[PDB]
Amino acid sequence: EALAGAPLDNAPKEYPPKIQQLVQDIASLTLLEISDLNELLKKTLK
């Protein structure tokens, strides 16, 4: 499997399918799940 990156200079920032799935999951998840995610992120880095 190849990266196949930089298809064109004017390409409107195409994204891989893998980066898209996590975005949808976060939106569907409730704030309570997000609240624990934010707290753990704060613990790792600030």
Binding site: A6, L8, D9, N10
Partner: protein, 95 residues
């Protein structure tokens, strides 16, 4: 390169090489760059300025040559051999 070394780059003041490295039809122009950016040819005069402007966006390979006089030499090396380009360049310099 040796032929170009003998025939100094006196009239020309600026040379510019533009190519797309991902494109398959640039190798010739690249070879041309390799020949023009050597001490044997560059040390003939310091008036000459060699510029390499490599771009990613899909465009035809081309080299630009600026002379001291009104002479102006553009050539697209998409379907031109490096040797042919060098010979044409030398002939133009001879004037």
């Amino acid at each position: 390169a040796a032929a170009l070394a003998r025939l100094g780059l006196r009239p020309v003041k600026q040379v510019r090489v533009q190519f797309c490295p991902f494109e398959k039809n640039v190798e010739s122009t690249r070879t041309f760059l390799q020949t023009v950016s050597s001490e044997k040819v560059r040390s003939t005069n310091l008036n000459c300025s060699v510029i390499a402007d490599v771009r990613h966006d899909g465009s035809e390979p081309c080299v630009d040559v600026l002379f001291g006089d009104g002479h102006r030499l553009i050539m697209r090396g998409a379907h031109l051999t490096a040797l042919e380009m060098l010979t044409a360049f030398a002939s133009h310099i001879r004037a």
